[PDB]
Amino acid sequence: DMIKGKQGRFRQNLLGKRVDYSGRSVITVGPYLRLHQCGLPKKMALELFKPFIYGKLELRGLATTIKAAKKMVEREEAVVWDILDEVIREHPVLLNRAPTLHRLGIQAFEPVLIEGKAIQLHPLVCAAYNADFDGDQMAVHVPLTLEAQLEARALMMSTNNILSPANGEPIIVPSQDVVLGLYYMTRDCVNAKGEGMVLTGPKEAERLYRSGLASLHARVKVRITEYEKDANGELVAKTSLKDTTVGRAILWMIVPKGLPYSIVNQALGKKAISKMLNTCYRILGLKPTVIFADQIMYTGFAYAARSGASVGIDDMVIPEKKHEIISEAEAEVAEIQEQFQSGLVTAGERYNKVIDIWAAANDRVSKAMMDNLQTETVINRDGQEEKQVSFNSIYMMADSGARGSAAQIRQLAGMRGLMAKPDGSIIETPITANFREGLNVLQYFISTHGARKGLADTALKTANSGYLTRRLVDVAQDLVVTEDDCGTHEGIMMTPVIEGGDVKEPLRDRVLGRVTAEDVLKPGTADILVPRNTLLHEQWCDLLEENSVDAVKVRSVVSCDTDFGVCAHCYGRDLARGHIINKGEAIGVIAAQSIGEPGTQLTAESSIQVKNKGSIKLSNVKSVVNSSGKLVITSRNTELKLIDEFGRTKESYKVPYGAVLAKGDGEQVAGGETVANWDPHTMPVITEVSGFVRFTDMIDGQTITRQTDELTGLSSLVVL
Amino acid sequence: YSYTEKKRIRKDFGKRPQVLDVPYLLSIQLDSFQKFIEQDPEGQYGLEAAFRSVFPIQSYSGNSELQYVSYRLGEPVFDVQECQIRGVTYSAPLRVKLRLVIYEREAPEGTVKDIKEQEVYMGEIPLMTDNGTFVINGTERVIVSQLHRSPGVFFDSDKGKTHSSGKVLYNARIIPYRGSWLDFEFDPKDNLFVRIDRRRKLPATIILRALNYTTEQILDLFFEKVIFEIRDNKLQMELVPERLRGETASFDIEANGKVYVEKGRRITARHIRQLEKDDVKLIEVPVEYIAGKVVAKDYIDESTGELICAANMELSLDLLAKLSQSGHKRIETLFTNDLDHGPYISETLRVDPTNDRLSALVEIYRMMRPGEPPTREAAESLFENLFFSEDRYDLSAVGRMKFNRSLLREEIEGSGILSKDDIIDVMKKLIDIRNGKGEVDDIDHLGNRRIRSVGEMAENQFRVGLVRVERAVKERLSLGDLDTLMPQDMINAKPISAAVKEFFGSSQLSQFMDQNNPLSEITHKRRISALGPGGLTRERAGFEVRDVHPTHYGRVCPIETPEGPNIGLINSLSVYAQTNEYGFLETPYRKVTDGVVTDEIHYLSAIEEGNYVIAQANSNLDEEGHFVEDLVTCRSKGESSLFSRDQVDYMDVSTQQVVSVGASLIPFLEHDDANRALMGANMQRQAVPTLRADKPLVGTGMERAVAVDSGVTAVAKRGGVVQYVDASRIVIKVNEDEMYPGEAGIDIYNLTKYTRSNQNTCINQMPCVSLGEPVERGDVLADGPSTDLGELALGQNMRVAFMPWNGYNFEDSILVSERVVQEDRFTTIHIQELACVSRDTKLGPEEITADIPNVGEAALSKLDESGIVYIGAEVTGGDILVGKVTPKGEASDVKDSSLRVPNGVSGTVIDVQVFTRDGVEKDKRALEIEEMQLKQAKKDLSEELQILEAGLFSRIRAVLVAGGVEAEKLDKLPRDRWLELGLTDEEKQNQLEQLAEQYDELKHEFEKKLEAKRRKITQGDDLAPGVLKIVKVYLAVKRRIQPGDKMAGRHGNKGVISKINPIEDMPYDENGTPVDIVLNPLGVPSRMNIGQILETHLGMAAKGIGDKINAMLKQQQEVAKLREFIQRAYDLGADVRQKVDLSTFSDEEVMRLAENLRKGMPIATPVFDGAKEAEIKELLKLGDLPTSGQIRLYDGRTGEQFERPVTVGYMYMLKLNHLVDDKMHARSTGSYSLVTQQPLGGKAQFGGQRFGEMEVWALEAYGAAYTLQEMLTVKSDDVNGRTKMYKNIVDGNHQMEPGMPESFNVLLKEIRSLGINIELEDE
Ligand SMILES: [Mg+2]
Ligand SMILES: [Zn+2]
């Protein structure tokens, strides 16, 4: 009993304990912080670091004995704060948030002493923590031994973890306020103050904007010197006149050396900023990316505040033609209902008709509202007038990707679509009103049901997720990278998964960071493009797109030869860092976490139609041309792929047995031309030769029942 | 208008005229407990019912009967307030009249002796307070109503998961209130099985066997017969044409000379009509057709006696031949239509192993008590008592009514016990639905879900006590002798009172009052919980149960429910709903007389609502109850659509009736998403009362209803005139009209000053009225916590600007200006209670003295000689609250057990109480507390006596003036010198002795009343065994708002206060006024709560008007201007039900009303009949503000103007109970746990964070091996490791010494202690 069982030993003993030198409190914004630091309350810092304080106080001789150190700390004299400041300089602390889904739930920061009782958390990392400032609390641990300190500063520090371990993309991308400010900064206007004056550089652009002699966005000719490291790491200045806004120049001040000007020249939304950070990281490296992100934050916050963006009742414009659309759809539903009461259409058919017409009306009103609101600013230049992408504050919040999607804009200004009853069936009459207007009892009630069901779904989904991820991390824990290279030639031939219409996911992303199983040749033999196993970094991937490699055999972990673990080469590079995997990292647990944590937001075919102009190619088929002049398909596993101009398989379809074909092999098919035909709910059996049908073991009455019609040759002979 | 209403009128929007006024909100609880007590003659619901149910108690054939007459509720010994103070339960003694009768023994029974017991005391029953709560140990408890499945019969489907091949298997469940359950279910093979309450499923027919029915009787009762006559040869069948519905023809159906249906063609409608009009009864049929049928009865050979075919046996040619030769002319076969009418009872009979009644009873007995040999009479008695014993099996009046209604029987009133006809009809309906001529019921229908309130549950528990005690009295009366004992040694009250107090105290539905907000109280009392006894447990219950059924309309709130794991299982009750006579749910509706919408209201339950077409409240009626539109929007079967004018039977009473009180308080609900409305209400119930609550600028009008109906306000009982006003009591002189003639006196309302609420908040009442103001019955004299002049003021309304300000409001976080903390408007008072208990140990009692060993006189300085802190002394964490010494034996001193202030809490000692039930010694503090209460009692009694005495003296002067006027000498000599004076001997002298003796009687009543009060004050307040005395100390602490605290709005917007900025930095408009709150815009578009924006606009309009009137008033132009301005404001358009005007008094009340509205005129937008945008625009224009509601602002720090003007205006915000100072927590090293040496868990004790398995995995994903190493050994569990690490840190070096954990070495020794060789290898 002492050994076995939960209460006894192992199952409880070494499973989940309370530790010391730890605290917990509420988190707060603190924008002024550096990316690698965190605001820590004085009183918590003193309480945590108490023994350090005593040690340092005794070392400095300020206290004869330890009890005197306690008395001096409980009085809290200036010396105590000076010693605390001195000990804190480089000592890092660990921050943790209750549901640590992935390894970015725990990170180390350098603390900065502040007043107050709230922990100040750097904004950019909130996305990593899934942290929200609505009463969420955070825990703070102190690493004691020296090795723990070194480990925290090297492996776990915030600046060292910029790429997600799950996929390679950056995690610290600006979220909502920053992107809004930057969006405001880069957008241009047809006519403003300081139109068309020529500036010698960004510095006088700032002179002009800050003195109020020119608008923050106004089209202008500026001389700029961009740098390019085209040579073997040398920077060459190219200096020319570009046509841009003042704001884009002001932003250009921060941008590090290596980047092309083009990067900032556009509207600069969420995606644009993300890809900017991506390029900055891939080209320059870590430290410039960090500093550039910090600069982006500061400038975005500042100019968002200077913008003064707000939300008034008049900012959401009800489309003028809504009422007409509603009256028309109501008249149509009334006509279809009356034509139902006469009994020419079933109830289900009427249901379908009403639901479809209401959906169409919803789409119409949504599109009309989006047209009205989006580009409505018809402002005038010197003479005639012009029109441009509006400055409606809600529209900027939508388009920038800071908050909200088109759906919520619709939900504000359009009709809020159809609803689902408990069982999933859709109510016949929709909710025609919107939140700008007022709902009535029924429509509200319905939306209440909707929200209740949604929330309960999210709850159960979270429970199920937790359970699934626990099993995953349990099973795969022991796998570790033990060897550098097993030296096998085996590998998997990886292709881009082209499901039907087009290339849902390209090769380049699919192969990036995998070592090759063997050298791949150009479309012409003895033209080696990649030596034996090489790590495929961006440059090799780019090289592959200019050529036309379609499928690449790459070493996979499953085929790895190593005993009791895997070898570095079979795995590949992908990490929060960029380089090939290091011997010793436990990839099982990172893999299990990366697959588990994101799992909390998861809830006819008659004719083929070629989408893009290309040659048709049939794979794994053996046809027999008949008299009608058709390439008769006699194989059930027949495929029809599409080779493009430069030798690449764009579209792929599976053609079943018995589908009428039109074009064979070689023929170029025009855009959207019908190449095949077959009955959807019918697979015909096709005869290859002619003549009379002879019955063999086809006896009448025992296994078949002759139910035959008259001369015209109708029958119901049934081979069951 | 009322006087408090005339004080400050609230501008009310809203178009439809309120026909029904909001009922008393706490009706449920009070009415239920009233029904519980409810002395009534005819045994209806009520304790009376329980008594008559259990009595008469007859001896075990001893002929000594016990009869019940009536009961009486004793008068409570302790009033409510004193009961809270003294820590006892507020209750009434229950007394019952019984008679013991002894009849002739060994003789025809005749009343020999009858003895009447002298009003036996049968225990204490807690009483309910005026507000509808219960005081159980000096803590206010609430008994939440419980929703549960009503007794009766239900036919469920339980499909989908049945063997995954379709096969929808139906089932009928019979559930009684008291008694075992009955269940009928099917099987894949359509055989219908019975399963006693919760056992295995047996063939149903066994029960039919127990009911004494033979197989032939059953097949008669169930199956439709088919007749085969043999006339002169070969098998002619009597046929009912209509039976053929849907049947392929098996033979050639010839009739009357002509073949009609060819053999093989299914009978078509043409053939059916032909045969029907031809009137064909009998047709000869080939023997092959009958060669397959089944026989109904057990046909014996009547001649010889030998049996041939048994009941329900398949027919074969040989049996047909034997029957035909035996001479059987009339054959009864079964009709087995494989499509519609199946052989279900037949097949069950085949699988049924039991044959006789006795074998069925044996199998039944072997099911309940498997393994012990069943004896016949045991089974007989068991089965009899199972379903037909009045005592054990009772459904209800409600159960029986529902039972009869489900099976469509006209009779409503039945017998409690389950009769046989019930079961047979139930089985008939089950097989009927199994054929498909019926629908299954849905459990979620409110017509199937009944509400059990307090009185019903208390009655059940009391009945349980009664059945126990009846068994007890039964045995004692049986064994013991009959005539010696009297009927009070025999009956024990202890277990009954024990059961009642366990239920009231230690029950799931009986919980502490959530007491920080008036809204919290009112919503807690009107709650419906589906958990508790006979309640669903949370984890198994499915998602389908927690959905909102269309039946909930107007009965339960769709939006108010905790968002935690038990969402949907709480469902706060709607505003207007009531309970039926039977405990169902009903809602009001206005009757519709074909054209006119009349004004009589009828309450409809769920089922009645289901049938009719109900019109919506927001339907336009013009002056005579007619709908303006020809086709109006209604709901009939839970689905809305358009119906004609002359079809609607009823109409909704008002728009508010859908939502609870909490949701009804939110303005502009119509513009908030349901999720954010839900969260808004749930949070709004957590707001803490501030120092001076003021009012919402944008309300809904319900604030006064909530404030009045909650018991937090002090409300006048008899109207009169306020005679004396103090900040502790309000004394009012009653008006002569309402003044009772004999022994009336005046009315005195004692107020309550700062006391501790359940949540540690302050509960203080302030007087509203002033000296000499007239008050009427039902006005609000004194304001409770967080209410002003009758209105609910949960929080405060401040000037917000929507903008991002250098990312300090980045996410939902909030920026706040230093003026709010300077002006102290968000500072709350909290109140902790501490208790020091001095018990009696066996080594000797501990002492409370102030003589405490080896403590410095600093600690004593704040203690009096008795050892209790002085009221008003400032204490800090660690200070000694009171001095106590534990005695030591085998010395008493040298150690201190004195209570100390908890660490890190510092406040002022506002109050101290001392409870010594023994009364040994008494103590100083008891003397002071007794004198404070006593002096008050004396003052009150003295006041009453002096008023009555003044009256008596006035009458004595009026008699003395008659019979010789004496006014010069009299008035200047003292008044007490008028009794000793004399008058001429007449009737007047008789009146003087009369008045002197009445004066004496008033004195004697005064003295005895005083003695009584002093006896009540002095007595020991009964404490638990072993405890000498207890001292409670209340600390009060003023907590100011600081960064990290949580603030919220009414619409679901939340935030943490991130920074306090200086006044100068905050944005300011041209006029120079800085904003108060800076709110993030990005919370609007994705969280589609637009109600806050309209609230901000309307609040700016209202505050603009208030500012304009304050400016115009400070210059004091003239009354005329004020009246004109206020009238033009109050009118504001049309369609409003306000109707105010200047009819009110001309000068004083207008000046007072202007003074109160100068801070901003309060608006009232009802929930769905609210204020449209145009009205807000108009009101903003009237104030001379931008019509768009946004203004240009200058940045107060830098001074440059902001482009694109921003929205500013006043919004009503609340500070929620999530206060940062409670959440923040840290530990370096501290106390560890006893058994497993891990650090304590908690906040009171230091306590560490829980490093869970998920965090281990997170760290493992990194290469962090050393962190885990310290985390597992050095940080928590290794004693030597922790001390070594402490010493190393103290030495100023930061290393560590590795090795195997000692716990691991212990593991080695423990495994090695077995016969297992486990070795530590080496290389
Ligand atoms: Mg949160
Ligand atoms: Zn390998």
Numbering used by the authors:
A (entry chain D): 329 to 931, 946 to 1062
B (entry chain C): 3 to 892, 910 to 1342
Relevant lines from the article:
To study how the RapA influences the RNAP clamp conformation, we determined the cryo-EM structures of the RNAP core enzyme and the RNAP–RapA complex at nominal resolutions of 3.41 and 4.8 Å, respectively. In the structure of RNAP core enzyme, the main channel widely opens for separating the β′ clamp and β lobe 39 Å apart. Because of flexible nature of the clamp, the RNAP core enzyme is prone to binding nonspecific DNA.
In proteobacteria including Escherichia coli, RNAP recycling is facilitated by RapA, a Swi/Snf2 protein superfamily ATPase. To understand the mechanism of RNAP recycling by RapA, we determined four sets of cryo-EM structures, including the RNAP EC, RNAP EC with RapA (EC–RapA), RNAP core enzyme (RNAP), and RNAP core enzyme with RapA (RNAP–RapA binary complex).
